[PDB]
Symmetry: D3
């Protein structure tokens, strides 16, 4: 957990995040060309960052956002496929792991159901070791089929990695779920458009803190014909403190070293802000002093999670009373999204 | 949701938070004296803040932290009791609601089990309308009996209020639970000691954003013989933007107006960052476009919450593998907290 | 007055500001081409921002700065004209209002007097509803004919709008004049070049506060052969707090919702910082308590404004004693600007 | 215009501002005692700040705020009087000029009309050289009789000084009026209570910039039984950049050197942001190039100032349409302030 | 190198810094009383910070600044002496190391030469393991005899510690000298008075970075009759990033864990910003590629250091040409300091 | 020392720094083309900045970084040469001085030894008045032959200028060496790649403060195939306060006026933070009061500098014990850099 050098050591994973300029693309040929630009970029970056072990690209960095439905379907990728092979070769050549974005990935029922929005983790031998499908697509504007699972994978030097996408990160639950599965680094890849710049910068830091996890964020930049993306790719410590952070600049890069031994030492020996431990051992001191055992309390005391787990339809109904009953709102209509 | 005036209108609740200097007290008489100081403060503040509808004091503002066990037991309060009556009279006189701290509140089995750490919400008629017992005590150093429930109460002008305490706020789950019950304001009362100053400032803002809720934070200041408390009491909008924030100064005050109609308009008509709505309607656009209904997906896709709810002992075991198996650590021992 | 969503409601106006990359243009054909780029941008942005009601472009976004006098004269626009029609069509297609820049607009005595520097407000039916000519051109370098009037126009959802340009905003008087005419939003369009970046960011916020008005700022970006423009387009609340702010990035966008009912509620019920009210009712409490009526004092107590209004030549003379007597300075000469 | 040393030179005025802890006083004897505390403070400070030429204390630093009317009347000062003599002796002993606050100063019709809220500038020989009565009292809560005039006085080393008070500074007009009279330093003395902390920090800087003037701000700190005062006393350059700024700490001090020759060189040779010059020579380049003389335009183009000057009752009526017609509001009533 | 917990592990040293309120004292008895207050504070702090291994107090925290010469001489301490014994007992009781300030420490020729300004490092057995005498007293106002040596001592858990005082830290040379002797933590104890607040906050961070060293800063707070001290005690990583930082509050505390293994891993394996290594191996890549050996260049290429080392009188003369020839300046005279 | 205008006066030097987009070049023809782009830029900038006296470009702005050895050798420049003539003509035409970068400059033994990394200062008559060869190349990645000397040259209006390059600035020694030679402005030209953005922003400010010198920094921007450069070109006062600072934007510009008389007045009359004076007159007050002369102490009390000067091999050995013995590290190998 240290910032400012280009090296890495046996204890540190060298992580690079990229403020990748958002592509504005329309065909499969243009996607492949851009995929090769990304590959070239990986290779060049390793020349300057000899400590690089992990390189992270934004959601949508490969295809851009395919606003047109037909083009979306025409350019949806197979995993493994040609794009991923192009990425894998860069990872082998530069001897790094990498996180790349396929937007879309063909649905099992392609072309009759919406593509997933997917991330892969590729190791330094070119192997896909994690494929993550976004669980919370950025509705209403974006139309991806939602995925249903998080994953933890052993990464460079044994660092445990989970991947999440853009909108996912607004939801504390996903960051929790990954850390509780053992994630030591949560990588948030995004094409996070203005407006919500300061809110997203803060969310990543707060989530690093709340889940005692390293966080790496690669966000897109530039204007793509619809959205302007605000950059601020960052790597953040498990103590909530930013390691390094980009600005809004096109193809900015940040690079930081995250210590394996430091996070494991913290998760073992931290007390007051060992949040993962403490959530499941509530009031341990109190119970000890009251003659009630030395484990604290594990039971979930939050009715919302309990209802959600046992009766999601009831939890949905409850939330519709507080918000609205239809996915759309007549005060700000959107074609294809129903309201009233 | 507006900052800088001393007024309030029929649409706004005037909220004041206090950077109350932490008391260093030892007897029941000294607690009562301090309670009367708080009452005097409420009355005086209303003279300057004619728009005040809600006044918020820090956790421990009444008793200080009773580090000595015997003194803890001797000064633990009854609710309703003498302290709360002293507070109620100030609320009636100044025609405001208030949030006060009783640390401890006598356990049902007093003096044979540890006191709770409690907050009350008192209305402008002197009535206790919410009593909240802290669910996540600040273990290891602090020895309160944990509570088990959140509450939502109709507050000034109909504003829905939930109370939480200090350490509670590090845990996104509680902020979620309150908002999902309908809370429009979550009041976090704390005696949050250094070191974790920047992390706590950020957490409150991130939680306001993530749960589309007003947040008010009253934190203690000063040095009490053990801890130095970092202030930065604040009121924060439901869009994640700070309204006003104190520094570390003793008996600082902040004051902001939070609009009833604005939060209800937002929760109704917000789309991209309607996080409460969106969590329980995932991928609605995608499902619509894939011919699968217009509600998105409600089902909880996070194995951690599911395991926690169905088998808390398993979730505890899982977390002990990632952290440690005993509440204490031999590398940083604490008397009465077991380790190895 | 809320930030982070892409929606808008019946109570909120959805405002988008653009960090438009400064053009480097030379002919009428190139201006028309760029005008069409702006139009395309409006249409695309509305696809991503369904709540957009008002889109704002920088001063000079259409023509760039025509440094060459001949090119300036050759490209000066008629209002209404071809450029404005191109903008109007985008406003109708995207169903938004827009603020566009014509630099120059032909003088009544074109080509024998310098063009104005002009802004139009175009409604969602394509109609020009306000034409503002800059009152304080950025002398010495820029040679526009000064305009002489501010305007207030009923905008989207009834929101009262005044337009001002760049250098204008350094002068508190203009922001006052607009608010005193009833403006609820002052839109400051600029091609504000480095150096004065932090000063201009602050001025906008201070003016929002001092005049209890929403403020929207669209500033140019990039290097155009002469100047580098610093971006930091922003929307700011009537309480002085930034809603969202761009960085220095080319074609950044910010978007915020400004509440109609909130500003009207504030201007009605604010007391201590109701600056518009208080300026013309000075010392009301004091006069009441002194038995002198319940209106305070309205009379202007500032000799400078009085002299300026009654004898501008005297006020000019006075200022020349404090500064210098000629528009130019021999220590930093500029061709065509006299000194000594 | 330079920060960080304790010295001063023949070109620089050494200015010290004090975050003076707000007194809570009730009698004339207690005022006199506190006045002597201030005197002792001046003398001690000069021991540490050998470059000190000007020392600035907060509004209300002498009396506190006399909330009780009877006590207000009983403690209202004569100028010159006993308090001012106590201050004068400190100024002679420490060989500095000073700015002190008398709240109240007896009205000509004392005790039958409300006291003024007054500031004096005392030179290093003990002489009162400026007496300023606040033009815009902080209504509604504060009940001072409004003054009607600004002043410019030759200060230490010839530096031209104007004094203003607290609420005054929210109004750009007063800062303008002083600078237009020749002020090179505007001293803003305040007991500026929370809430409006960030807004006031920004206002001072913006006013320094807009009026090409040094600004010094001394603000009170602490809690006085009613209000908490936020400190952030500061000295600011004529270019809008802070020299030094206090935090919220009780009896903080800041100290900066402001160059005489630098402001005079700037006001003479600045061009693009010579705001005082440019306001009264609008569009000079344009008029030159259009064959219309080389002075630009002086005429006031802002209808609000013109109406205010010629018909203040009309300007008042106009503003009541935009805000409200009575000084009070039934939604937030205050005893003695009428509404409906 | 991690922030926010109260624990420490076998790899981390738990460092606490104190924003100790500056005493205003006059006699030996009052010094002893205050020394006991400090001791009580250490003991209490350890109760809250079970990970504390090192506690740091400000320069002057024991005596205050003895402005009066006679009182200075009367209260100058012996080391070891009564004060240090009082500190040692607290260190043994709380099982921590500590850094305390003796101002003055008796000169070998006491009372005929000025006292030193001294710091001790006391281990957890009560033993004085380092005594540092300030090399660069804060002339002109402060009159301590200058010391002549830095020291490195093995501290808690083997962490190498050097101590420096206040004004010392403005001079990059001292931070270099300590790190080059092997210091892994440089502790800067100060009573750093306003004005130079932001400059000192930055200096510490820059020095941490430039010398790849942990830095801990304990600075005094409050007003002592002469100076106001600005706090902002901090612990900073060897990568230049702040761990935690106090504000200006009286008796604030910060606490951070600094990893032994992380700094040693960095100093071993860092490349691009291994500043200690690189200073003495300049241009290694270039020399390798030019066929000139694989060590780079060690020779000091800076004529100033060379002249300083070989002929300090010449280096002094040189600097007097650039600044002034006498220690005093007639433009800002100080009694006892000669000028002209 | 003032920010925000485009003018300059007889007392001020108008300095412009450029966030020049890093070139990606391969041949001598492409270098010459880019050199002409820089020239065109200088000329255009002067049109907008009539006060410009000094224009500063980033290290590598002319050639980019020639990563390929053969291309490095093929494009290495002669000084004076064709590139410098192209720059000189721009300086004469725009009547400014300029700082340009030749990377490489041919070694005396070209092409058999690595090129230098060089900066020139060109006066407004086209004359090269300073040629600086980088003393601390950015090893390991960059392979320039190290230079061995700093220089001070009389610049525009007599302002004394020293030039330094990129990595140089991490080392306080060089900034000292220049100031001690009389430098009043140190110009740091850089192509400072991410990661170390915040550290470099801070270093420049800290060095301005520590050496009582103006500092100007021109840093490259953009991505060049290997590195992303973080901009934040800046001009900084001799008091450590930023005048103006760019962001990360391509071809940003900043411009500030630095006063000749202000720095000379400060270096003459500053006392407490006259760091250049004080370093060589330590403890002057103390020695005076102890009867030991009125000059303080000049002798260098830092063993590291003494050893470095007398025995650089010993100082190298010492540092290798603290860091590592070989220029390379087996944990992060780099081809051509030896380790183990
Ligand atoms: Cl999505
Ligand atoms: Cl607790
Ligand atoms: Cl203009
Ligand atoms: Cl008032
Ligand atoms: Cl000293
Ligand atoms: Cl280099």
């Amino acid at each position: 957990m240290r910032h400012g050098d280009i090296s890495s050591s046996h204890d540190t994973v060298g992580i690079a995040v990229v403020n990748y300029k958002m592509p504005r693309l329309h065909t499969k040929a243009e996607v492949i060309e851009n995929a090769k630009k990304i590959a070239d970029m990986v290779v060049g970056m390793k020349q300057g960052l000899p400590g690089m072990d992990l390189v992270v690209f934004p959601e949508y960095s490969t295809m851009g956002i395919m606003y047109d439905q037909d083009e979306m379907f025409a350019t949806a990728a197979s995993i493994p496929g040609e794009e991923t092979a192009i990425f894998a070769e860069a990872c082998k050549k530069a001897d790094t792991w990498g996180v790349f974005s396929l937007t879309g990935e063909k649905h099992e029922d392609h072309p009759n159901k919406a593509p997933y929005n997917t991330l892969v983790l590729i190791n330094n031998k070119g192997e896909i070791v994690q494929k993550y499908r976004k669980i919370i697509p950025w509705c209403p504007i974006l139309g991806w089929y939602p995925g249903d699972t998080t994953y933890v994978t052993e990464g460079p030097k044994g660092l445990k990695i989970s991947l999440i996408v853009c909108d996912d990160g607004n939801y504390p639950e996903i960051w929790r779920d990954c850390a509780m599965k053992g994630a030591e680094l949560i990588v948030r890849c995004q094409g996070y458009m203005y407006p919500a710049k300061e809110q997203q910068i803060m969310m990543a830091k707060a989530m690093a803190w709340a889940n005692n996890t390293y966080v790496a964020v690669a966000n897109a930049t530039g204007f793509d014909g619809v959205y302007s993306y605000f950059g601020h790719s960052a790597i953040i410590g498990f103590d909530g403190r930013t390691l390094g952070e980009c600005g809004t600049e096109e193809n900015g890069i940040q690079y930081a070293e995250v210590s394996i031994s430091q996070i494991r030492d913290f998760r073992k020996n931290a007390q007051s802000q060992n949040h993962l431990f403490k959530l499941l051992h509530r009031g341990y001191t109190g119970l000890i002093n009251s003659g009630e055992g030395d484990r604290g309390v594990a039971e979930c005391p939050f009715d919302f999670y309990r209802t959600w787990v046992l009766d999601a339809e009831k939890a949905r109904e409850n939330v519709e009373k507080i918000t609205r009953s239809t996915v759309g709102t007549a005060e700000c209509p959107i074609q294809g999204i129903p309201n009233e």
